[PDB]
Amino acid sequence: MTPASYNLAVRRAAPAVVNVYNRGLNTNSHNQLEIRTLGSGVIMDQRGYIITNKHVINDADQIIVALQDGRVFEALLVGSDSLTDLAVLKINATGGLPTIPINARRVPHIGDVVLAIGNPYNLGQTITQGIISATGRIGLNPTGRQNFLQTDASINHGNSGGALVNSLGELMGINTLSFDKSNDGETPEGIGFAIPFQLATKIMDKLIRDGRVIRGYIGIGGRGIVVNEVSPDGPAANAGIQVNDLIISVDNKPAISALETMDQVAEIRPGSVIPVVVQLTLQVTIQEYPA
Amino acid sequence: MTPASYNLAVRRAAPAVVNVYNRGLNTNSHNQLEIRTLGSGVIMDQRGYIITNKHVINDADQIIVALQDGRVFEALLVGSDSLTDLAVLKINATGGLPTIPINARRVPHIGDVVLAIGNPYNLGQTITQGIISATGRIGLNPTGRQNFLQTDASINHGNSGGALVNSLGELMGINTLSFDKSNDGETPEGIGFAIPFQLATKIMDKLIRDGRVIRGYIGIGGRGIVVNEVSPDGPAANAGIQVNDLIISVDNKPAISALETMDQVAEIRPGSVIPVVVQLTLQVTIQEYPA
Amino acid sequence: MTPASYNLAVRRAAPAVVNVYNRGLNTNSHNQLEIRTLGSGVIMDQRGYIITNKHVINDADQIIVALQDGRVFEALLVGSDSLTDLAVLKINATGGLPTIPINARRVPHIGDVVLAIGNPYNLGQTITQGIISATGRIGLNPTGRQNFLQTDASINHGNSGGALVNSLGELMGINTLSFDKSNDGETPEGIGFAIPFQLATKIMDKLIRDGRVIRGYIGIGGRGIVVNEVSPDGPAANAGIQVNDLIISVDNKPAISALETMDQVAEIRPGSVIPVVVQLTLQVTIQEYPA
């Protein structure tokens, strides 16, 4: 017979994950480019756009990307975002580049076998398999390290930026980090997180068209949609809205949930204005999220 | 094609695992119900019975159970058992309850893919896959943390009480991982334990019919069946039997092994009496296991 | 339906993995055979040869081997090798022995599902599944703990010597197991190593025909094939070759790579002589690797 195996996935996607190297100049007294850090990255399209974790390329005087085919490139940082730890690099490749399979039509499911491609502890490219333990949201609104994708695939230090792909090689997400906890008593085995591919995608496109992800701020909270503690003063305060009420429509559509609502405000460019219901339609001008 | 995936099992059994919260009153000075601990639990039948680990609900002034569908319930402790760390709660659900798939006809096998549904570190429901690395016994006699079910599936803190199900959603066991994990000089990966479903079944039923699991005590040891150290002074001493001999028939059937023998004595209600053989048939009255 | 399962593989290969016990006499003051250590081992053929990790049987006054069928044997150490941590024992079994499936025709692939059979923490035989994350070389030349086989299958202490088999039971490698940490901060999760079956084979045969693995030493380094730091003063000095040049043909064949070249010199018995090329063909006598 044939042994059970996920090599097909490896063949189809592995060639697209890269080693990202963060090189600083002031790392030594002789001020030469030294490898301050390193992680992994996923070549997104043939134009040369590579996704990766921000915490990898932060304060990097240089960024080198290297392919499994041996080609080495200097990368231009086109933008990052703290609220997701995603960063978008760009190599200028002539000759063709391998690209991570993407299937925008595929919906990830709790339980789907998934492999994590990356370069942890800088041992070279390694693959590890697990399943999707929790899916998380593809919204643009930051919530925490719980609305990501969760996997029991082994995510070590060096998998950051790597690819989490299903058995068909399809990119399910960008590995971000492990769960190491905050303290001890023990270690959290098999609890890793990845940013959903669908979101990495949204973020990348923005990081390209703007050099930074522009989120629409409405400063309000809650649990229609409860408005519990709406004392940020930013946009809430400035133009209708109270420190305790219930909204009906974020802009001109239902305000069923709090999460699904914020996820809309953020997708609204600054300066714009929209009619906020509770039936006293009070308009408000959207600002830009805080630093 | 279609991504390899164990989602079917997740769909069939996930809805039945619950978040069990141990709330104490004297946890703070304002003596309010504070979440002293927490674990997971499996809704066993439509009557509202839920299995869980004892160590989760111990000394709980209150017990709250929450479903993935959002419904929350106050749970009535119907019993527990130290020798297995199993506890049976009971929520009073009108409207219908989701129930963990069970297939008493199914025999677990070393190597079967199995998923562990539970809520570790209180991150919300998480699934993790592994295989059965060892099966263990379904007996009622306590032996240790070796005659359980052993799985490399990721069992973290908060998986206690959760379900361990095979690819079909069939309940293979109740996650219980107990603490002997460590040596000296490095943390034990992929070695978790679960109580065979067959036994969790036996125990729950008893916890229901008696509020406590009543075990039949004999007071002997060994390796027919060797009667090594038979100096408990229990019912063994009180009625024939020596501090060094060989038994022939626990009650009126073969005494082939020591394990399979104890597992019978325990299934014999106290006060009863049975003929013990070795050919000098000496009768003995069964007592009840120690506290 | 049927539960997803790797049981077939377990049935086919588990029976061949054995518990290896290292018993020393001077472990106590009453100088009796005490279990100084322990690991696992794979019965390679019906003659009674068993492979294992050197670091298990080192300085063992005695060695006991035990089968899953219950049979116990006293083993004869036929040899070991440091550069691979492989040891070969030999039990003298009459009545027949179970043997690990081997398919020398099979080529291991990154991503192949694979199970690790072994006895970690001495809890009895345990199975764990993972995938091959990196393959490594089957050469006879020592390189490091990187040209081994790499798997995310859980390799714990007591898995050393165990077998790593694919879904068909086929022997993929002998679990070695690198001590993971070597420093702190975090712990290398899911990164285990095994010696390729293809090499364990080559090594065992040598350990048999010679009691020690005789390697052919040259004394050179580099990156044709660069000869960068050819100052070891062995046979390289003694008869042509410079401290900085480029070789053309290890013996009478291409010298394309440095790795694949050394892998040849080692397979050349001492005393022999071969023509080295670089076009000034200078012959050299092969010595024997250092202790």
UniProtKB/Swiss-Prot annotation, chains A, B, C:
InterPro entries reported for this sequence: PDZ, PDZ_sf, Pept_S1C_DegS, Peptidase_S1_PA, Peptidase_S1_PA_chymotrypsin, Peptidase_S1C
Keywords per UniProt: Cell inner membrane, Cell membrane, Hydrolase, Membrane, Protease, Serine protease, Transmembrane, Transmembrane helix
Subcellular location: Cell inner membrane
Periplasmic compartment spans: 2-291
One of the record's GO molecular function terms: serine-type endopeptidase activity
Highest taxon of the lineage: Bacteria
Uppermost EC category: hydrolase
CDD domains documented for this protein: cpPDZ_DegS (cd06777)
Modes of activity regulation: Allosterically activated by the C-terminus of exposed OMP peptides (consensus Tyr-X-Phe-COOH); cleavage only occurs in the presence of peptides. Inhibited when RseB is bound to RseA.
Keyword Plastid: no
GO cellular component: periplasmic space; plasma membrane
Reactions it catalyzes: Acts on substrates that are at least partially unfolded. The cleavage site P1 residue is normally between a pair of hydrophobic residues, such as Val-|-Val
Residues holding substrate: 143, 218-223, 289
Domain PDZ: 224-269
Annotated membrane topology: Single-pass membrane protein
Main location per the UniProt record: membrane
Gene Ontology BP annotations: cellular response to misfolded protein; protein quality control for misfolded or incompletely synthesized proteins
Residue positions of the active site: 55, 85, 160
EC number: 3.4.21.107
Function: A site-1 protease (S1P) that cleaves the peptide bond between 'Val-148' and 'Ser-149' in RseA. Part of a regulated intramembrane proteolysis (RIP) cascade. When heat shock or other environmental stresses disrupt protein folding in the periplasm, DegS senses the accumulation of unassembled outer membrane porins (OMP) and then initiates RseA (anti sigma-E factor) degradation by cleaving its periplasmic domain, making it a substrate for subsequent cleavage by RseP.
Additional free-text comment from the UniProt record: Regulated intramembrane proteolysis (RIP) occurs when an extracytoplasmic signal triggers a concerted proteolytic cascade to transmit information and elicit cellular responses. A membrane-spanning regulatory substrate protein is first cut extracytoplasmically (site-1 protease, S1P, this enzyme), then within the membrane itself (site-2 protease, S2P), while cytoplasmic proteases finish degrading the regulatory protein, liberating the effector protein.
Domain statement: The PDZ domain probably binds peptides ending with C-terminal Tyr-X-Phe sequences, which activates proteolysis. In the absence of OMP peptides the PDZ domain inhibits peptidase activity.
Family membership noted in the UniProt record: Belongs to the peptidase S1C family.
Subunit structure, interactors included: Homotrimer.
Entry protein name: Serine endoprotease DegS
Annotated source species: Escherichia coli O157:H7
Gene that this polypeptide is encoded by: degS
